[PDB]
Design a protein around this ligand. Structure first.
Ligand SMILES: Cc1nc2c(-c3nnc[nH]3)cc(-c3ccnc(N)c3F)cc2n1-c1ccnc2c(F)ccc(F)c12
Length: 777
């Protein structure tokens, strides 16, 4: 029971009142499932458990200091040496140990591969680790255990809330209609309106595909009012026969992609009531039955269905787009080949997950092609897979079981699945499904729940704190609310709630002691908070800041930074390190989330605000933080990151860049904050005091500049190869309801910036056109 109450606070809704056997089915089925995984988990070998709880954070001569669970010993080792070898030094049997990063949830392949080690090499800090014996790891593991060929007709009985009242009714597969829409008669505005009018569609009932959905639009004429959709099949495959009442969603005219569950605010939802003509008790045929069984271009793809399977396995997608889905034989045949289809590359499955592949068998097929996804790939695509959950038609689906499975097998997966689900629980459409999934996951780690509660309580006191700061600053100076802010933070409950947590931005980072002294807040607008931490165990890698925002929408920034991080991975996985900074960014709730602070950096504007001439400002700041020899690295740091963000900002169409939202690190790395727009919703950007830095300050030094210009072009064509990768993810993201990612024209921005129609060298001469266009500043 306490566990039940804990799950209810964490996920934000109470745990029944719907007595819906679909919902009851989901919960007990998935709970058995999730408890199975948590059982398996407790029986893993101790290196298998590290892999679960602390997945290694790789990327695609050396001083290092080691202790055991207070005396440390410093060594030198080879950047090429294996953690084993390090341990063996430390011992003077190594296989009985792992290396923990001090004060992080990280354990340690040549050390040149470990994120924490390069985050130390590139930054001169000296790695500090701890030998943790395998007995002691087992302790954690243990501590964390618990036949009918008439036309389909419905009937539109009547309605309930408020010229002339039309209803439009369409039948769709995906966002394709299996026939013609039917409208109603123009009954008069006011009501509670009556229709009692049979609507009959040009489809045989034996020809509704398993995933068919009836879609209504209620509007007003001499203006739209409400929309609503449902499956003609229940979640047990039973064609549904009867009277259903349809609590409608408000509008924008049909909306086949929107949810198949009704508007839950039954107090003000227009209801549309309707009759489903019974027809005999008909369940959609089993799989085994089914297996027994320009337009000229479509016809010659249906055509050699077989040659496509034989010789073009990955063209699956566009054979599924030519398939006549209203014809049940056209579907048995296609669906018959698909049970023999060779598995597909991840890229191709990322296209199949989309909504214009509604059929649940293809969805299964797509999932099956996704079990080979590495955990690092899953993590990169994870946001899209979450948003695709909104397209599903039932609660129990391969997609949900696949995530839960992966979530429960990698704790960093589970961590982020949780926050993605939790962050939308305020959205009517999805609250039930996301709530239900967070619940099954919680019965998979009763331990991780308690860690997440901990994060939630901090996120909760940050909300209160910001609210007091918004109120307090209305009446008071910036410095007077600041010291009030600290007094509130100093209270009892705030110190306890805000301290000793895993960072929701990155669970491997630990937020221990909140440094009240160094907290502050932006005194403009939504009063975003600056919260700083320290940890004596982690040393300097314990000094970490997080920015809290309450008021702003962070979904867009998060997507943009995932994309830049994807870019940097693509680039690093072709040899090219543009030295990017994809900092953490995570919506946690309604207009609420977190930003990872990048320490030791500032804004162009703050740097320009002051040298004799403004162009000297950046270079002199760089000269100041990188003495003598060291400037030279900064200039290359600066130059690569410049090119990388020039390419990134251009592709993603991020305008509105100015000297307050472009930042620079003391290493010389330049990076962008505050995204919020993108897709133009832009020209190549470039600014002579950047040019100035790239040229070592010398008036014009075309031997530096041109190679900088070669960086940009290399990045641009690297990314241009993976343009489909970018197109497919964004396609899935249209499910997010992001306002700048609304329609088709948004995705057609990306198509252009990525010259995706043209050749590799014709796009690069066109890229060359923009780059000089932009240079004249
Ligand atoms: C207003 C604002 N937005 C941001 C963003 C950002 N991102 N999306 C959307 N807005 C990112 C970073 C940021 C992020 C990472 N590293 C560093 N250094 C940053 F400045 C800082 C941001 N700021 C801030 C600038 C100055 N002072 C701030 C403060 F006192 C408290 C909180 C603030 F947010 C501050």
């Amino acid at each position: 029971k306490l566990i039940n109450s804990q799950i209810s606070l964490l996920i934000g809704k109470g745990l029944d009142s719907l007595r819906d056997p679909e919902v009851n089915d989901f919960r007990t089925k998935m709970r058995q499932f999730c408890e199975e995984a948590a059982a398996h988990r407790q029986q893993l070998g101790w290196v298998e458990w590290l892999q679960y709880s602390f997945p290694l954070q790789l990327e695609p001569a050396l001083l290092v200091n080691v202790k055991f669970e207070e005396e440390s010993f410093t060594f030198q080792v080879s950047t090429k040496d294996m953690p084993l070898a390090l341990m063996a030094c430390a011992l003077r049997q190594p296989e009985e140990y792992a290396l923990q990063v001090n004060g992080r949830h990280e354990y340690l392949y040549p050390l040149c591969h470990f994120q924490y080690i390069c985050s130390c090499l590139h930054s001169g800090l000296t790695p500090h680790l701890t030998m943790v014996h395998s007995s002691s790891i087992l302790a954690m593991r243990d501590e964390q255990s618990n036949s009918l060929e008439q036309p389909f007709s419905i009937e539109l009985i009547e309605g309930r809330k408020v010229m002339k009242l039309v209803v439009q009714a369409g039948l769709f597969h995906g966002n394709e209609m299996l026939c013609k829409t039917v409208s109603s008669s123009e009954v008069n505005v006011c009501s509670e309106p009556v229709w009692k009018q049979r609507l009959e569609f040009d489809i045989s009932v034996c020809d509704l595909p398993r995933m068919a959905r009836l879609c209504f639009a209620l509007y007003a004429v001499v203006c739209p009012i409400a929309w609503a959709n449902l499956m003609l099949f229940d979640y047990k495959d039973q064609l549904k026969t009867g009277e259903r009442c349809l609590y409608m969603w408000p509008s924008v005219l049909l909306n086949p992609a929107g949810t198949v569950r009704g508007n839950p605010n039954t107090e003000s939802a227009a209801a549309l009531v309707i009759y489903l003509p019974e027809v005999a008790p008909v369940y959609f045929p089993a799989l085994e039955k089914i297996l027994e069984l320009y337009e000229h271009e479509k016809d010659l793809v249906w055509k050699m269905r077989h040659e496509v399977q034989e010789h073009f396995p990955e063209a699956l997608a566009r054979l599924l787009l030519v398939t006549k889905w209203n014809k049940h034989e056209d579907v048995a045949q296609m669906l018959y080949l698909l049970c023999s289809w060779p598995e597909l590359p991840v890229l191709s499955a990322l296209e199949l997950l989309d909504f214009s592949f509604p059929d649940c068998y293809v969805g299964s097929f797509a999932i099956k092609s996704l079990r080979k996804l590495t955990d690092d790939e899953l993590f990169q695509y994870l946001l899209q897979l979450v948003q695709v959950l909104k397209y599903e038609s039932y609660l129990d689906c391969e997609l949900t079981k696949f995530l839960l499975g992966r979530a429960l097998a990698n704790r960093k997966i589970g961590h982020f699945l949780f926050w993605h689900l939790r962050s939308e629980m305020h959205v009517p459409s999805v609250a039930l499904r996301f709530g239900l999934i967070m619940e099954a996951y919680c019965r998979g780690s009763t331990h991780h729940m308690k860690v997440l509660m901990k994060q939630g309580e901090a996120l909760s006191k940050l909300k209160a704190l910001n609210d007091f700061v918004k109120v307090s600053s209305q009446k008071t100076t910036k410095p007077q609310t600041k010291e009030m802010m600290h007094m509130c933070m100093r209270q009892e409950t705030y110190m306890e709630a805000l301290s000793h947590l895993q960072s929701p931005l990155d669970p491997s980072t630990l937020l221990e002691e909140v440094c009240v002294e160094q907290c502050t807040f932006m005194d403009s607008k939504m009063k975003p908070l600056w919260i700083m931490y320290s940890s004596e165990e982690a040393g300097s890698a314990g000094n970490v800041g997080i920015i809290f925002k309450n008021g702003d929408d962070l979904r867009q920034d998060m997507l943009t930074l995932q994309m830049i991080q994807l870019m940097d991975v693509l680039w690093k996985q072709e040899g090219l390190d543009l030295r990017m900074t994809p900092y953490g960014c995570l919506p946690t709730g309604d207009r609420t989330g977190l930003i990872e602070v990048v320490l030791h950096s500032d804004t162009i504007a703050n740097i320009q605000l002051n040298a004799a001439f403004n162009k000297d400002a950046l270079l002199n700041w760089l000269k100041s933080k990188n003495p003598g020899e060291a400037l030279d690295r900064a200039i290359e740091e600066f130059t690569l990151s410049c090119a990388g963000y020039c390419v990134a900002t251009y592709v993603l169409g991020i305008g509105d860049r100015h000297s307050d939202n472009i930042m620079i690190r003391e290493s010389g790395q330049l990076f962008h904050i505050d995204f919020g727009h993108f897709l133009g919703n832009v020209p190549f950007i470039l600014t002579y005091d950047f040019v100035h830095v790239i040229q070592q300050g010398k008036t014009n030094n075309s031997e530096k500049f041109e190679r900088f210009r070669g960086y940009c072009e290399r990045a641009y064509t690297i990314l241009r190869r993976h343009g489909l990768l970018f197109l497919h993810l964004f396609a899935l993201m249209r499910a997010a309801g992001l306002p700048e990612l609304s329609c088709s024209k948004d995705i057609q921005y990306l198509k252009d910036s990525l010259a995706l129609g043209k050749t590799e060298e014709e796009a690069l001469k066109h890229f060359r056109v923009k780059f000089n266009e932009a240079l004249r500043e």
